[PDB]
Amino acid sequence: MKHSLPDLPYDYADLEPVISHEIMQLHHQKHHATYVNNLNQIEEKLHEAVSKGNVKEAIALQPALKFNGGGHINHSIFWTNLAKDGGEPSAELLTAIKSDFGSLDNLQKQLSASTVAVQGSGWGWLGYCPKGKILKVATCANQDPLEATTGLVPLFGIDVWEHAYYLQYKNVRPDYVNAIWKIANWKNVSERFAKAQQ
Amino acid sequence: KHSLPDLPYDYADLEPVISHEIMQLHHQKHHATYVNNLNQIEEKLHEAVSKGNVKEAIALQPALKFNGGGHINHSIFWTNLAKDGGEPSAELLTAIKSDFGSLDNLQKQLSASTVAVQGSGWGWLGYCPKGKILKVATCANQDPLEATTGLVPLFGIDVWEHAYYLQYKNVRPDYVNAIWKIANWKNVSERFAKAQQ
Amino acid sequence: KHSLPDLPYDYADLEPVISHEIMQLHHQKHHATYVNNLNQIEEKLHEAVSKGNVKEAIALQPALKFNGGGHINHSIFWTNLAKDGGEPSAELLTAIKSDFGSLDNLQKQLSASTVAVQGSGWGWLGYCPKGKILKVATCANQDPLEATTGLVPLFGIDVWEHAYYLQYKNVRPDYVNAIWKIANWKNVSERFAKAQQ
Amino acid sequence: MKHSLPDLPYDYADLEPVISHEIMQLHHQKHHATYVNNLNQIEEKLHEAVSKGNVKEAIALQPALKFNGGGHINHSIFWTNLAKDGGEPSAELLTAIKSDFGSLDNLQKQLSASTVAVQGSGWGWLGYCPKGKILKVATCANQDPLEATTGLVPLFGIDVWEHAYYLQYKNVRPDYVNAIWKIANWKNVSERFAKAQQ
Ligand SMILES: [Mn+2]
Ligand SMILES: [Mn+2]
Ligand SMILES: [Mn+2]
Ligand SMILES: [Mn+2]
């Protein structure tokens, strides 16, 4: 068993004009592949340490597992979160969206603001709190994955690492964050919401 | 399986620097709890990693560092103390003088850094295998020195309030100063020798 | 200048939940130290910012958060406790039931989160002005709730070991459970009303 | 009194082929300018809070001051750290370099490795410990400035935020980190070392 780089649900140029094909190819083939490749090696070293009962070595490996494992989790979710033909939120999801945010417009505004405000590299997420049964906006630093680090089940994420938009948008992160809503795969988000309530 | 080590001395053997009650609680309750939790968390982590459950493996990280670190830190700490801990080896004293000027200077610097810890944590005299020099470092909570910094621990000062409160109350500096009276230089010297291998 | 507030009760008035000695040390030593240090650090920060010394201003940040936070947190904490603290207001109980199902559920959730704090910190019942709902949150060390999260503090549980060790020793959960007996619901209710303005 | 965007010691295309003119212009006119502009506003708000004795507000402003103030400190140092004609380390500096690293080659190797290993956005620095009287390699996250956060006096820094190299180097951060040594302003580093020993 090993982790593998998932195929994108679309071709590399399918998200143009919102995300360029060069960003998509680099992001997928170089950035995500690197996280996966490192993840496999780190997981092996971690299993080795844990099997030995070597607590020092297991702790030492934690930042690398979080970063690469998180990188893999986050990008895997991200690819599915996007579509040229996203559709619209499910009836169940919109009820909750209206309940916790008032409207879809309020949700998009709040997620966009929080995401743009990330200092350095990171992610913005729409998440579901299983315990509170409530929808939440959260941000994560670097590749810290949402669920593992907060308990929130990720529904929709926006990658704001500079590699996610710089070639196209340069320093103008807000233009990317607002434009990404045009390609939000609501069908996928709705599916994730349904699973998160199980 | 990880186990609570026996102390190298009786619980009252470090009085009047650290009381019987502190030693007993610190060993039988605090360290024991870290060990027990460590075993539980290590088992869960083994399962998660075995099955390639990266989410679960990441989720367990704070608990493993805290409890695993607690086990590492306290295991070292007990061996770092003694009723009569002697003096640094010739080799260690040479290194101390080289890196800190004098034993008094080392004590002063490590004590000051340790006292300055905000909240719970540890003060450490450590050896850097890369620079081949001694260094003062502090760690938050139960973050273990070597796993998190690469520095090999030689002498640690626990400044979690449970390490001194029953006796010293708020006066952490007095505990940090007094612990030098029971520093087990035989052990610190042995750790220094091993760190150089 | 920042000053140590007088307690709303005598030092032994919270017995047998929190001892006279704990209250006296916690107030006269721990809180007093945060206040004294806060005044020193605020003065240095005023000077640094006045002169546009960004380096110095940044360097003072851990000390200001720790000591300023200590002052904020303990100031609230004293008012959150009482010998006879009554019951939540009608309004607060409605909000508690809405957000947590029951007062018992709130107590359980906040107690569990607070007990789970690794190292030194605080447990808080807070009000989110954005969501207009009650929330359980924890803070590390002296990180103050509102400045760091935006949540308005309503009821806090200090789990720094100095808050309970002399009496409860390692058994933090018993202290966290017992503190509900002296929760000053009059004050929590007043804070809730003010948070809604 | 206010903070201002310093002029670069050279023209925008002067660091080509090692750093492109588009990177330099964006980095200076957009990224650094943003930090300065925000810094001025945040410092005013902080002075207001501190003058009032409003501890909550002063604490609340800390991340924004660290980030923007740090951004300003770091980039200000960075521009001076580079040159088409850097020269060579001073006699005093090289003695210390040899003492703490064995050689210049060992220093460059170690700083390069640490810098490349930064997870997310950050900086790699050659720093001077005033207390230990020793040279150290350190890294900083996001815009955390070296001296304020560690006590180490910065001598030479390498910006590894993706905006510092992506347009040119794409994902290949190591090529940028190794190539930046070609433009290291040793005269400036030597000057900083001399001041740090005072
Ligand atoms: Mn990415
Ligand atoms: Mn301890
Ligand atoms: Mn306290
Ligand atoms: Mn930069």
Author numbering:
A (entry chain C), D (entry chain C): 0 to 197
B (entry chain A), C (entry chain A): 1 to 197
From the paper:
Here we present the structures of the two MnSODs which are strikingly similar to that from human. Gel-filtration chromatography indicated that the pure proteins were tetrameric, a result that was confirmed by analytical ultracentrifugation (results not shown). Similar to other reported MnSODs, the tetrameric quaternary structure in MnSOD-2 and MnSOD-3 is accomplished through interactions of the N-domain α-hairpin.
Extensive studies have revealed differential expression patterns, with MnSOD-2 emerging as the major constitutive MnSOD. Specific activity was estimated for MnSOD-2 as 3622 ± 80 U mg−1 per manganese and for MnSOD-3 as 3261 ± 26 U mg−1 per manganese; the proteins were 60 and 100% metallated with mangan­ese, respectively. The C. elegans MnSODs are structurally similar to the human enzyme; superposition of all the Cα atoms of MnSOD-2 and MnSOD-3 with human SOD gives root-mean-square-deviations of 0.5 and 0.8 Å, respectively. One chain (chain C) in each SOD asymmetric unit was found to contain electron density corresponding to the N-terminal methionine residue. Two cis-prolines (Pro16) are present in each chain in common with other MnSODs. Asn141 adopts ϕ and ψ angles of 52° and −125°, respectively, such that its carbonyl group lies parallel to the indole ring of Trp160 with the oxygen forming a hydrogen bond to N∊. Lys169 adopts ϕ and ψ angles of 54° and −133°, with its carbonyl group packing parallel to the Tyr165 side-chain ring. Substrate access to the metal is controlled by residues from both subunits (not shown), while two residues from the other subunit forming the dimer contribute to the stability of the active site. One of these residues, Glu161 (MnSOD-2 numbering), is highly conserved and may contribute to intersubunit communication during catalysis.
